[PDB]
Amino acid sequence: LADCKGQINSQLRRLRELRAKKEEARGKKGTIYEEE
Amino acid sequence: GLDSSHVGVRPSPATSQPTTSTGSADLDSILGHMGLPLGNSVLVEEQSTTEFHSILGKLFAAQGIVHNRISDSSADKTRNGDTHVIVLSLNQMFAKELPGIYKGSRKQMKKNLISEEESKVTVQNLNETQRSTPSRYKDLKIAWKYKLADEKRLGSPDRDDIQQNSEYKDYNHQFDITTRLMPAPIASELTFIAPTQPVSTILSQIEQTIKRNDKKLIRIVIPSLLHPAMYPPKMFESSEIIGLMHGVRSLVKKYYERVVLFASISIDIITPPLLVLLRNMFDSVINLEPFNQEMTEFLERVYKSQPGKIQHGLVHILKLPVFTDRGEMRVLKSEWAFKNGRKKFEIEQWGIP
Amino acid sequence: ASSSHNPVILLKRILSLTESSPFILCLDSIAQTSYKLIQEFVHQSKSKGNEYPIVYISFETVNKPSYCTQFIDATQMDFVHLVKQIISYLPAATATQAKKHMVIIDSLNYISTEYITRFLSEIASPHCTMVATYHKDIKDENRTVIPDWNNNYPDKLTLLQFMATTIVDIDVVLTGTLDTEEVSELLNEFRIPRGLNNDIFQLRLVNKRKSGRSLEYDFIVNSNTHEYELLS
Numbered sequence A: 001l002a003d004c005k006g007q008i009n010s011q012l013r014r015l016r017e018l019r020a021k022k023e024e025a026r027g028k029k030g031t032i033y034e035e036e
Numbered sequence B: 001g002l003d004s005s006h007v008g009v010r011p012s013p014a015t016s017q018p019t020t021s022t023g024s025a026d027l028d029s030i031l032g033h034m035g036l037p038l039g040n041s042v043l044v045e046e047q048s049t050t051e052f053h054s055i056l057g058k059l060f061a062a063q064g065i066v067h068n069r070i071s072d073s074s075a076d077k078t079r080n081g082d083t084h085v086i087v088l089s090l091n092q093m094f095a096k097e098l099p100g101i102y103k104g105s106r107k108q109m110k111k112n113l114i115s116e117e118e119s120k121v122t123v124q125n126l127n128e129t130q131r132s133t134p135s136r137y138k139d140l141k142i143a144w145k146y147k148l149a150d151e152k153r154l155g156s157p158d159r160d161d162i163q164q165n166s167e168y169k170d171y172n173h174q175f176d177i178t179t180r181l182m183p184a185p186i187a188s189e190l191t192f193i194a195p196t197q198p199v200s201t202i203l204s205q206i207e208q209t210i211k212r213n214d215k216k217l218i219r220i221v222i223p224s225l226l227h228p229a230m231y232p233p234k235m236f237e238s239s240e241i242i243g244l245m246h247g248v249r250s251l252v253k254k255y256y257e258r259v260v261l262f263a264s265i266s267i268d269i270i271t272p273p274l275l276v277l278l279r280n281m282f283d284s285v286i287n288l289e290p291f292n293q294e295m296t297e298f299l300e301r302v303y304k305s306q307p308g309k310i311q312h313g314l315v316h317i318l319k320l321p322v323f324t325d326r327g328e329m330r331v332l333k334s335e336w337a338f339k340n341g342r343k344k345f346e347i348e349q350w351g352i353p
Numbered sequence C: 001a002s003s004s005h006n007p008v009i010l011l012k013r014i015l016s017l018t019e020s021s022p023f024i025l026c027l028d029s030i031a032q033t034s035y036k037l038i039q040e041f042v043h044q045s046k047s048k049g050n051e052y053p054i055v056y057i058s059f060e061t062v063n064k065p066s067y068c069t070q071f072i073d074a075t076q077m078d079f080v081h082l083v084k085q086i087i088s089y090l091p092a093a094t095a096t097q098a099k100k101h102m103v104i105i106d107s108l109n110y111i112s113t114e115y116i117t118r119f120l121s122e123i124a125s126p127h128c129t130m131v132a133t134y135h136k137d138i139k140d141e142n143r144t145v146i147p148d149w150n151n152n153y154p155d156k157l158t159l160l161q162f163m164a165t166t167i168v169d170i171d172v173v174l175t176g177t178l179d180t181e182e183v184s185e186l187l188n189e190f191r192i193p194r195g196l197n198n199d200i201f202q203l204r205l206v207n208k209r210k211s212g213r214s215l216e217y218d219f220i221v222n223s224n225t226h227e228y229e230l231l232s
Helices: A002-013 B025-031 B053-067 B092-096 B199-211 B240-254 B272-278 B296-302 C007-015 C036-047 C079-087 C113-119 C156-162 C180-188
Strands: B041-046 B083-087 B190-192 B217-222 B261-266 B285-290 B313-319 B332-339 B346-349 C023-028 C054-058 C102-105 C130-135 C166-172 C201-207 C215-221 C228-230
Touching (some): B041 B053, B053 B261, B083 B199, B092 B190, B199 B240, B240 B272, B285 B332, C007 C201, C036 C130, C113 C156
Parallel strands (some): B041 B261, C023 C130, C023 C166, C102 C130
Antiparallel strands (some): B285 B313, C201 C215, C215 C228
């Protein structure tokens, strides 16, 4: 349970939204450099 | 001259004479002496617009700074490692950009199997405890028996003791990308020379710079020489450069115990006449042939699924220290592949993939 | 990586100055002149809206360009003046946070090599974008330099290919009954046959990146609808 809580917290804290979406088919958009 | 027991008074498997290490294990091994005997000069070369040459031309100075920044008590004595570093270039901005001594974990030694996030800790955005970025074998130390195409005993068993035998191996320090050898030095370690000023001034200035030290090592490194970005047309005459190089040769051959020379340029835009007229002046020539877009296809085909096995070019050797002047042919072209990724500038024996 | 996943997108980003480029070089010849690419700049770099001063420094051109906003005649200025009466219109190397303008040089063949690098030193700023064309069919003057055995230095072409961060080559697409051999011949003895100097042309693109190898591709460019097609 402690591991699950830590995993959830770490997973939900590292959401940086990937503000380099090509700016600002195979991938169908070209957005996998460390995504998916 | 230089008193004994300096960092690089190592013997040589041929002459048993002083041979300071270039710092890179494969650069010390391929050269053929665990470095170069004092009084000789080396010419690393890059035939294209790539700029791998800008890497080594830093550590060769920085490693010297290392021996000038550890002046504590040795096993019993206080080791001498002072090496006045000189650069014949106006770019003072280069000074504050050198890689530093490498510490911390270098490879992975997981007790259990290597696996993904759920196995040990967390999401890998916070990395796992011991080591990340799988790269099994990372070069660490120096050896006196690491020469390529030489006898056996190619390994130094990560020895952690200081002795007279530690002059040979197990002292020299590794560096990496993010490491920084801070703080920046002072005039005690780095001396910059403006190249655009006339050679008559440059020669006397470098004379006075070397002579003011009496029993200390002098290292000379030129990052880039004779390039349009920082040089005037007047210096491209066939007289000035050759005469300056002749003076440099005269002085380095005079002080065969306390000075060396290491310069490297790009020759994609150099007239062959001047190139081979100056290539005969010093006593070591090494070329580099980086890979191009037609072959990176097969590079990733054969090195597929590898995060640290990707190479970047091939190596040529055309001249080496004195023991090639005795009538032996030793030119070798495009047989060893050099890699400078994010770890461990390495040389591996293979031709085209 | 996750940027410029199509060559056409890269070309359009270059053309519209979305990504800054300190230096770009374009090569042409007599078989196809290079004033259509300025039209490409004008049309493409206006979708993003660059009405910023498009200075047209001129050495030989007789007419005043409509598509540009400035006009400078340099048949009476020396090097130091030529640098000095351009920093005013351009965003000179002051005001470390400022805009960027457009620079069009009509010709590169009339300038002595001895100052070439300096002409890119006193002006190079993160505010300016140098655009100039190079005619390859004019062999420069070399009596003054006296290329003897003791007076040597590299030639203009290599310096131009070295200090450039992006290179584009222009060629005329063969359409009718003329092939490269006889075309080059007839040009050598100057008969200039029909089938030359059209708006539909072809380009070769070489784009250089920091710490790496450049990329080389080819393009087919029309000067009528401003549309592109990458080499198959």
